[PDB]
Amino acid sequence: TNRRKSGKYKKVEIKELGELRKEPSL
């Protein structure tokens, strides 16, 4: 069921990088 696995990492790709986006550090 690859579609369900992909969705988990897709959240991280946006949010976890989104923490750095809060700026300056985190």
From Swiss-Prot:
Compartment(s): Membrane
Post-translational modification as stated in the protein's UniProt record: The N-terminus is blocked.
Parts of the chain on the Cytoplasmic side: 1-26
Function per UniProt: May function as a growth factor receptor.
Superkingdom, taxonomy of origin: Eukaryota
Tissue expr: Placenta, pancreatic carcinoma cell lines.
Provenance organism: Homo sapiens (Human)
The protein's name in its UniProt record: Tumor-associated calcium signal transducer 2
Parent-protein start and end of this portion: 298 to 323 of 323
Record disease entry: Corneal dystrophy, gelatinous drop-like: A form of lattice corneal dystrophy, a class of inherited stromal amyloidoses characterized by pathognomonic branching lattice figures in the cornea. GDLD is an autosomal recessive disorder characterized by severe corneal amyloidosis leading to blindness. Clinical manifestations, which appear in the first decade of life, include blurred vision, photophobia, and foreign-body sensation. By the third decade, raised, yellowish-gray, gelatinous masses severely impair visual acuity.
Entry similarity comment: Belongs to the EPCAM family.
Organism lineage: Eukaryota, Metazoa, Chordata, Craniata, Vertebrata
Stretches assigned to coiled coil: none
